[PDB]
Enzyme design. Sequence first.
Site, PDB file in Angstrom:
ATOM      1  CG  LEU A  49     -15.678  32.862   3.634  1.00  0.00           C
ATOM      2  CD1 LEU A  49     -15.325  34.311   3.874  1.00  0.00           C
ATOM      3  CD2 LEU A  49     -16.759  32.746   2.586  1.00  0.00           C
ATOM      4  CB  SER A  53      -1.090  23.760   7.139  1.00  0.00           C
ATOM      5  CE1 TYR A 122     -17.211  36.843   2.041  1.00  0.00           C
ATOM      6  CE2 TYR A 122     -19.301  37.982   1.941  1.00  0.00           C
ATOM      7  CZ  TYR A 122     -18.495  36.913   1.575  1.00  0.00           C
ATOM      8  OH  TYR A 122     -18.965  35.899   0.753  1.00  0.00           O
ATOM      9  CB  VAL A 123     -13.258  40.602  -0.389  1.00  0.00           C
ATOM     10  CG1 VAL A 123     -13.126  41.097  -1.819  1.00  0.00           C
ATOM     11  CG2 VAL A 123     -12.461  41.476   0.566  1.00  0.00           C
ATOM     12  N   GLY A 126     -15.029  36.545  -4.286  1.00  0.00           N
ATOM     13  CA  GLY A 126     -14.255  35.323  -4.360  1.00  0.00           C
ATOM     14  C   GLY A 126     -12.789  35.525  -4.745  1.00  0.00           C
ATOM     15  CG  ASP A 166       1.652  33.020   0.501  1.00  0.00           C
ATOM     16  OD1 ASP A 166       2.109  32.279  -0.409  1.00  0.00           O
ATOM     17  OD2 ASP A 166       0.768  32.647   1.304  1.00  0.00           O
ATOM     18  CE  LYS A 168      -1.037  30.951  -1.418  1.00  0.00           C
ATOM     19  NZ  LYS A 168      -0.668  29.638  -0.809  1.00  0.00           N
ATOM     20  N   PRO A 169      -2.763  33.629  -6.838  1.00  0.00           N
ATOM     21  CG  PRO A 169      -3.237  32.798  -8.982  1.00  0.00           C
ATOM     22  CD  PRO A 169      -2.165  32.854  -7.938  1.00  0.00           C
ATOM     23  CD  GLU A 170      -3.672  29.408  -4.968  1.00  0.00           C
ATOM     24  OE1 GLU A 170      -3.186  30.356  -5.657  1.00  0.00           O
ATOM     25  OE2 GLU A 170      -3.197  28.245  -4.965  1.00  0.00           O
ATOM     26  CG  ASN A 171      -2.785  34.288  -0.438  1.00  0.00           C
ATOM     27  OD1 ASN A 171      -3.597  33.450  -0.031  1.00  0.00           O
ATOM     28  ND2 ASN A 171      -1.522  34.288  -0.054  1.00  0.00           N
ATOM     29  CG  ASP A 184      -4.143  34.243   4.043  1.00  0.00           C
ATOM     30  OD1 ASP A 184      -4.846  34.560   5.037  1.00  0.00           O
ATOM     31  OD2 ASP A 184      -4.152  33.084   3.586  1.00  0.00           O
ATOM     32  CB  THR A 201       2.916  29.201  -2.335  1.00  0.00           C
ATOM     33  OG1 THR A 201       2.112  29.603  -1.207  1.00  0.00           O
ATOM     34  CG2 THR A 201       2.208  28.068  -3.079  1.00  0.00           C
TER      35      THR A 201
END
Lengths: 350, 13
Positions: A49, A53, A122-123, A126, A166, A168-171, A184, A201
């Site tokens: 998913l 790094s 699990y979410v 997305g 951290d 951010k929209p990714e998280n 995260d 970030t």
Amino acid sequence: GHMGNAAAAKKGSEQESVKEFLAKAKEEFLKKWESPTAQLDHFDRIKTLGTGSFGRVMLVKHKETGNHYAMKILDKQKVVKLKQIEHTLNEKRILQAVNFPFLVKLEFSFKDNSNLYMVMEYVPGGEMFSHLRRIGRFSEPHARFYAAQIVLTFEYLHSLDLIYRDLKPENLLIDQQGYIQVTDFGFAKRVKGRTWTLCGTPEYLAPEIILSKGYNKAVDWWALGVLIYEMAAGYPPFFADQPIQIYEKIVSGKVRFPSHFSSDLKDLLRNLLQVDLTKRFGNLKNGVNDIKNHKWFATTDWIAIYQRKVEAPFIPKFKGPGDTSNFDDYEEEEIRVSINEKCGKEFTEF
Amino acid sequence: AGRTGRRQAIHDI
Ligand SMILES: CCCN(CC[NH3+])S(=O)(=O)c1cccc2cnccc12
């Protein structure tokens, strides 16, 4: 004044009830922090998913129950080389002990000769990141709905002396009801006052991090300003191709706003994206209330958000329990487990 | 001009 008598008394009682909530939440957190569960062949691997790094996350299926989970896999030797030992121990320990509706829930953790594993809910909706890049930008009400959840989550975490570090929209994952799940916690840390690690970030770093100061939880409020700006603009306020140039823009601090930003939004963002810590919202005598009582949030029912009773602006399509259609495709890498134990002493506490 | 893809965290500057 701004508030009539009845509104003022309602808001005061509300703020006292927040104090009472947070005091009980701290009791519960400390109990779990002081007195805190599976193995790999218990799961089928389905799909990666996300990957970076500092680790990777896989959809897995629990064999006995058939429940689906998101399994974070960390390579012990990689964690040691990148000097992330304490950060990885913080991530597990914090996730075990917290409890809030917008924090992803940890279900299991374990290790083997080569890796560390953290099995989370699990979410399936997305990352906010994908939905934001696809639509371009969120309207201010849409951005405000998500922002309010982050404000409450940081109010909760900071009351426990936890910094997140951290945002951010990714998280930020979108759940089946359209609400946020923060994921995260690899940079989360229990911090009473100052801490010094250079991490986060680039686009979301507060200037005091870049300038190698001993900084505090107000870096999270700066990052909220970056998040709200990016949600509402479609791009962040300090935007450049390489980190060194991003840092230069952050430290100058001169923010420019799209012409479609409302005056209320710009005022909130100037007070979050504030270089001077004596002036940054979330870092003043009035604390989180400078944010929650700002005009841009005047339509926000904070209790209704916490209770998840506000209708979400977007409900992801859900095509089944193990459906991954709201995630991107990644190159699939083996889960290799050496015949020999690696880094046993480093991770005895994990 | 800037980064539109997913952004990696940094562990040092
Ligand atoms: C190394 C990427 C990890 N991710 C977060 C950053 N993007 S993540 O893969 O999105 C993800 C992480 C944690 C829990 C999850 C629960 N459900 C779906 C995904 C989940």
